[PDB]
Design a protein around this ligand. Sequence first.
Ligand code: MPB
Ligand code: CL
Ligand code: CL
Length: 163
Amino acid sequence: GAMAPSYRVKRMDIAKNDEECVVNAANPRGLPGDGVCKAVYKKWPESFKNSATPVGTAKTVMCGTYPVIHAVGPNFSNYTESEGDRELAAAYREVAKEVTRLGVNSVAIPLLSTGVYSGGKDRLTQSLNHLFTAMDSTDADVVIYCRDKEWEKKISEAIQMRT
Ligand SMILES: COC(=O)c1ccc(O)cc1
Ligand SMILES: [Cl-]
Ligand SMILES: [Cl-]
């Protein structure tokens, strides 16, 4: 575990993380996909061997000795708000289990279901709060990765609000 487990946010490509493992915002079929998933495919393509896994689950595949945790959030274009919310919460619970099993001291995580799976809605708070619910009981340093300046500011304020 980390000496003083913390949350941090960085605005940069998760493919250039400085943590002991990465969470992919995966699709259920293990395809190269778009956005975070395509950056992860370019950096760790070996990790996509038998990476397909259902919505609301996480499946870890090694790239060398570096673990890629493929976490499948719901596409809110297909799910109802209610069922989507349940699957998004479930995906993060499975990420916490994998991070624990791996024994890593740090993990790089994107906000699941906030990009092309958002159903055209701002889901920063919804996704971040499900991340906190899952990861609060783990002792890994969590570093949250985002793209846009507005998002960095709001994620930083939410982290600072609980301290
Ligand atoms: C924080 O999100 C990313 O790391 C990311 C990487 C590549 C993309 O094309 C989009 C997002
Ligand atoms: Cl970058
Ligand atoms: Cl997404």
